[PDB]
Amino acid sequence: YNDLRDFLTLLEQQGELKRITLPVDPHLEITEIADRTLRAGGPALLFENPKGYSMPVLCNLFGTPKRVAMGMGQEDVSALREVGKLLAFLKEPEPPKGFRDLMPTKRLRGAPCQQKIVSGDDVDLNRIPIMTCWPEDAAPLITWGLTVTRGPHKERQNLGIYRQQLIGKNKLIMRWLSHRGGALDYQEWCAAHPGERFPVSVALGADPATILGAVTPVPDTLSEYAFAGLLRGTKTEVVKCISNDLEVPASAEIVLEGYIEQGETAPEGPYGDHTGYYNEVDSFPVFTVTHITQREDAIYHSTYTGRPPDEPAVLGVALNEVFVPILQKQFPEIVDFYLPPEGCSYRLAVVTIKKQYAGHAKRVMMGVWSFLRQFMYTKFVIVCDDDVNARDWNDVIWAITTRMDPARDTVLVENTPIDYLDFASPVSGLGSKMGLDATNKWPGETQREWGRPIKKDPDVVAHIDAIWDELAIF
Amino acid sequence: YNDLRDFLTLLEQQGELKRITLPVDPHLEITEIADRTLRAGGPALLFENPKGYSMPVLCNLFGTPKRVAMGMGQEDVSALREVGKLLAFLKEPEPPKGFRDLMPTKRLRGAPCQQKIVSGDDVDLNRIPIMTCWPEDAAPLITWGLTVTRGPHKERQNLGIYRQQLIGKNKLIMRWLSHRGGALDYQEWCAAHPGERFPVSVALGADPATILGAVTPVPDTLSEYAFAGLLRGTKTEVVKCISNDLEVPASAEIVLEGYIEQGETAPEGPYGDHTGYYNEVDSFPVFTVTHITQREDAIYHSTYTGRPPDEPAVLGVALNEVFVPILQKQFPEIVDFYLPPEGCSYRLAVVTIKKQYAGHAKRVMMGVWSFLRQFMYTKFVIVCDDDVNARDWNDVIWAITTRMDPARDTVLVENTPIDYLDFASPVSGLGSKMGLDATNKWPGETQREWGRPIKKDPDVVAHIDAIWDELAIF
């Protein structure tokens, strides 16, 4: 509720947390245990005996949709929809001047995240149990922790999740993939104040809300921290940094302050990410840590990415539950909107609508590839009717195979924008998308007598639904 | 401002209104005069000497974007954008219950629209100067006038623009093309109270706001009349009908009350519409007028449809100016969004964006065919950069021809939903769309050195801009 600690005591009570006092190595061993754990439901893991470190390593926190929901003050995967409704409403708060005639950040003075402090001369990052994920990974990599930066002229600050490679006792690599967020504030600062070092701060182990707030996309009409307030219920308590004016959550577990030396870059050695493949070496800015501030008995929050199901993959499933309502408000025909993890969290989407006229499927298609920005890179879209479970491959494959004619019902559009790292494309940043509607064809779409689908009896599915537990089948 | 009369006195002062006291026939003669008039700017026309009628015929009211703007209490085509901003904001008024803890219709008792009244026995529609538009038209056809209906269970009422054919001294044809609006309230009433007559009322010559409100699409989170209030500035004054509970604007010029006899239908003889072609005969419900109420010295508001530029065509150009901001809020890359009349008000759209990455053009493409419902039938979309005037065919054709490779830069998608009346399609209600992006190609989209476009000097275009009037060239 207020900070991570409280979230873990809550989870531990609800059996959602497990403590591995046994000796475990943060060098690819924690991943293995976490992987198996996440691959089977599993609670959040808290290793308090990392081989060679004093900081317990906390991972797989949002390894279940349930826990993701809870982290947003909802305690119900379904409730996420309410968060979608909110997000929509936040976009248009006030009307234009023409017809207009008709949650602040609580800054504290002291903060537990500044209980212990070390700077410059002695800021050994080697003391932190930063973990290595896969055997061919370059080096230890910070995976969580929200990076905080500020523009050269905008008062508002941004929270970003960028993985950080350990290249020195006090140097990390700042991998700002996007052309927005922290990456924008930097290329902008370089303009306004060329040569002068760019201030940067990373907060590890903040309250679930500030974390999830940084994850969920929010309208520019609201500050990241602000959103966290609505989710949490109360205003988020931040605190001034030491070497800069940036603001980091006061309850954070560990906070890294430093800067980015204009021009200083470094090759981000190979790393395996959500796709399940290793990223090829690339150059990126290097973060210089001049200050490490933490709590007493602070725990290190960390995660990993690999072939899905992934820690982030599940976070995305939980996060897609919030977009559904935002998507429906736009296309009331949409019943369910789902993006299976196997499809790398965003590469494929299944949409089930209530078809009300021939050709309808194509509209939802274009809709998905254009409406929200988080679905511009998905290259596969399957449109189905409301009598199929978008989340059950048996239902979807049935639809594809019974109510579809490949050549006739497939829509291929070329030269669309695509993820720069999607090696499977013909050219970096440019590829094709495929839409396949498997909706019942209406007269016009077909000249044949369509099949009468088997529809279960509501009362029966309801009766055995109650007697089910009495039938000790499992 | 308050009623039509006031709008005409305003226009007549501003030279936007002309009175044709000369004898003119409402049988296709008024159209001819109006057509030429509209085809050259021209003011609204008010024929006060229709051959064989006592009611002056008022047409071509919104024959100019200027006048459309004015009719919305803006007096500026640009201001329409503010109306778009408003429309967007009206969609999401209040937040969900979860995080919630943090313009009525002035009904009068009397009304000028009920100053003169006739019913049943004597409700001759032949007294009204209903005009015939084209030589092959079936019969006189009411073209304006908002049809008011109410659902069998929803308190809210709808305003609709449906053309009405004169089939009797007191029978009109109710052409509810859509599957919504009045057409929905009828097929719904038939369910709730089968056999019982469906109440219907048509108001001719209402205040420009109520008219334009009925035209512009508004979110179901607001009543048609309500919207008119914001536009007008003051709440719209409505008044109870005589033979039903429907509410019509009290300042209306003429009001037709009656019902629709379940099952009673009639073939809507051929008529030429916006496309510039004659519609083929079709069956539709028949409106029985049991009551005709009007003002003293009431004028008949009427219009027509034919090959564009059309009275409605211009209304649409003015109405598209409001969607631009609603479109931009969604795709900030969109600079200008225009739909030329020649393309039948909606069949073609030109979009100019600020391309920020390869393949971008395709996104705005899908965006147009899916975002708003008023652009689902457009089958042609041209995407251009911000250095071209979307409203100047010279600029657009230049773009198409210089920065595009037909096969490479054209996107064809088949079996999309299309207007049931678009005879040019392979099958009714089903057709294909073509997207052609003529945006500068970026590396990846091409392997050739793209051309450096000629860009005018801002200061020069600015200098001759001032000295222009001094240069008596025209």
UniProtKB/Swiss-Prot annotation, chains A, B:
Keywords from the UniProt entry: Cell membrane, Decarboxylase, Flavoprotein, FMN, Lyase, Manganese, Membrane, Metal-binding, Ubiquinone biosynthesis
Intracellular or extracellular location(s): Cell membrane
Superkingdom of source: Bacteria
GO terms assigned for molecular function: 3-octaprenyl-4-hydroxybenzoate carboxy-lyase activity; identical protein binding; manganese ion binding; prenyl-FMNH2 binding
Its membrane topology: Peripheral membrane protein
Regulation (activators, inhibitors): Requires phospholipid, a metal ion, dithiothreitol and at least one other so far unidentified soluble cofactor for maximal activity. Inhibited by EDTA.
Enzyme Commission (EC) number: 4.1.1.98
Enzyme class: lyase
InterPro entries, sorted: UbiD, UbiD-like_C, UbiD-like_N, UbiD_bacteria, UbiD_Rift_dom
Gene Ontology biological process terms, A to Z: protein hexamerization; ubiquinone biosynthetic process
Catalytic residue positions: D273
GO CC annotation terms, alphabetical: cytoplasm; cytosol; plasma membrane
Binding sites annotated in the UniProt record for prenylated FMN: I161, Y162, R163, R175, W176, L177, R180, G181
Family, per entry: Belongs to the UbiD family.
Protein task: Catalyzes the decarboxylation of 3-octaprenyl-4-hydroxy benzoate to 2-octaprenylphenol, an intermediate step in ubiquinone biosynthesis.
Protein name: 3-octaprenyl-4-hydroxybenzoate carboxy-lyase
Annotated organism of origin: Escherichia coli (strain K12)
Gene: ubiD
